[PDB]
Design a binder for this molecule. Structure first.
Ligand SMILES: Nc1ncc(-c2ccnc(Nc3ccncc3)n2)c(CC2CC2)n1
Length: 529
């Protein structure tokens, strides 16, 4: 039997690779032989004409007898492609074997995946073991405060979405029903479950008041110094604003952190057009949590990229590879405003302007005599690792608008990227390089002939080989985002996944891919001359 060779190629395919008429009839011919292969069920379900009552009936029979698929593959079954109630329930049942830690990593996409669900089932669950996506998400949210906090904010922003409201009123109403269903489930739950609902309410009003505070500061006609004094004044008045002192509510940005209020004196506005605020949150244990509060911007694209960077960091750490990345938290509280976790760092542009180079900066704040080029071995290892991680991650996500004001550096050697306005190949200038690696980074690791540069390339291959192994999960997650109001996705929804897939070079073998990665680093470093 030599047919199993061509058959195994079809099974190993990416989730978004369309099966040809020939491949389709080959999978449908050998269905029963494939019931022992789990990664095959995925390929089997896309051969079925679900509009044919006889064909669907036999397929649902095979589903039952089939070796259950991994959580990662069940995500495909929740995309717009499947409408079969039984296939969608099967996906929920497989997603259920995953723990809350993995579930949270997928929550952003699953809230999107609700627009592919039965809208009538969602509405009818409202008061006048085999759950749908809505029922499952609420079920898990009632048992986990962290899960419930993100479910609240991810859904509220979709309700608030005015573009969805006018261009698709059916979808907007479904999300209001998802919110109503969640609120209903919380009020019907235990003593612990019912307090969760008032905590979400408290956070909502805190955000509402914080929004109002931002608008009140702009009433002050004066300069930034006068605007800052205005911000600090209003923040001190807890009778009026009620933001310096509040009952310990979870921080929307990181719900595991409970807060007492915002320190009024250390609160300032950033020198930028939209003037976002830098706010220090008093935690329950007397600590400080710096946040950026942005009003007049849609953080949903940055929220998606940072959620993917977080997943890629977790996947790499799981493979015993800590590339010292900065997956800072981003939570959108509206389509008009949101939070970002503040990381203490210096933009690479300010590094050059004040110290001349990265290596000078490193020598100033972290010197070591026997260390490479007079810099600490720990700081240098951190920098080489982070450069590598970000080089591969930005390449995969096709991050544009890379300039030295949105490349940040820490004194501990951590290098990270911010502001993901241009993603999936888009850039302000035409013909962008596929590898975003500038001369400043190369010079920081001691030039193209250093041992650090060789380690950097090595780390790049490792990271690229590890992330390619997780392409199925990443591509499934991006596939659930196709119809989301994410600017760089909404431009070409139908072409989005393919833009990510091509970066993996899944056509090449592990050895060929390392060759491609080493040449791509070569050609980009070459172009810098
Ligand atoms: N769009 C955007 N995306 C991310 C960040 C961000 C996120 C996390 N940490 C930091 N840190 C710094 C940044 C600039 N200078 C020092 C630290 N910045 C920022 C910078 C804030 C001025 C608005 N903007």
């Amino acid at each position: 039997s030599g047919i199993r060779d061509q058959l195994n190629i079809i099974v190993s395919y990416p989730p978004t690779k369309q099966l040809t008429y020939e491949e389709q009839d080959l999978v449908w011919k050998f269905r029963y032989y494939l019931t022992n292969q789990e990664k095959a069920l995925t390929k089997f379900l896309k051969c079925v004409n679900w509009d044919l009552p006889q064909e669907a009936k036999q397929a649902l029979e095979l589903l039952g007898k089939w070796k259950p698929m991994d959580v990662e593959d069940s995500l495909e079954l929740l995309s717009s492609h499947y409408t079969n109630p039984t296939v969608r329930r099967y996906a929920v049942a497989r997603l259920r074997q995953a723990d809350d830690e993995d579930l949270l990593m997928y929550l952003l996409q699953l809230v999107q995946a609700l627009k592919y669900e039965n809208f009538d089932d969602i509405k009818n669950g409202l008061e006048p073991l085999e759950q749908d996506l809505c029922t499952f998400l609420i079920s898990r949210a009632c048992k986990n405060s962290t899960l419930a906090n993100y479910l609240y904010w991810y859904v509220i922003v979709e309700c608030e979405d005015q573009d969805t409201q006018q261009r698709d009123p059916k979808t907007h109403e479904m999300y209001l029903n998802v919110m109503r269903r969640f609120s209903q489930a919380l009020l019907k739950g235990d003593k612990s479950v019912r307090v969760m609902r008032s905590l979400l309410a408290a956070q909502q009003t805190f955000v509402d008041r914080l929004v109002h505070l931002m608008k009140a500061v702009q009433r002050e006609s004066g300069n930034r110094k006068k605007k800052n004094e205005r911000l600090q004044a209003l923040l001190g008045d807890n009778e009026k604003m009620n933001l310096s002192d509040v009952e310990l509510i979870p921080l929307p940005l990181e719900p595991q952190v409970k807060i007492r209020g915002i320190i009024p004196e250390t609160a300032t506005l950033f020198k930028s057009a939209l003037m976002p605020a830098q706010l220090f949150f008093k935690t329950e244990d007397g600590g400080k949590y710096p946040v950026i509060f942005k009003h007049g911007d849609d953080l949903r694209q940055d929220q998606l990229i940072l959620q993917i960077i977080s997943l890629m960091d977790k996947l790499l750490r799981k493979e015993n590879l800590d590339l010292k990345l900065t997956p800072y938290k981003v939570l959108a509280t509206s389509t008009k405003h949101g939070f970002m976790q503040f990381i203490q760092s210096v933009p690479v542009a300010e590094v050059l302007d004040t110290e001349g180079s990265i290596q000078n900066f490193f020598r100033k704040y972290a010197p070591s005599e026997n260390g490479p080029n007079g810099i600490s071995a720990e700081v240098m290892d951190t920098y080489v690792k982070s450069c590598a991680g970000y080089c591969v991650i930005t390449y995969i996500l096709g991050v544009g608008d890379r300039h030295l004001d949105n490349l940040l550096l820490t004194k501990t050697g951590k290098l990270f990227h911010i502001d993901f306005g241009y993603i999936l190949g888009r850039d302000p200038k035409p013909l962008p390089p596929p590898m975003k690696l500038n001369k400043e980074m190369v010079e920081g690791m001691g030039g193209t002939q250093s041992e650090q540069y060789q380690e950097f390339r090595k780390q790049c291959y490792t990271a690229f080989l590890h992330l390619r192994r997780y392409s199925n999960l990443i591509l499934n997650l991006f596939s659930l985002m196709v119809d989301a109001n994410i600017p760089d996705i909404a431009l070409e929804p139908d072409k989005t996944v393919k833009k990510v897939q091509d970066k993996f070079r899944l056509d090449l073998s592990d050895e060929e891919a390392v060759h491609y990665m080493q040449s791509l680093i070569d050609e980009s470093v070459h172009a810098l001359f």
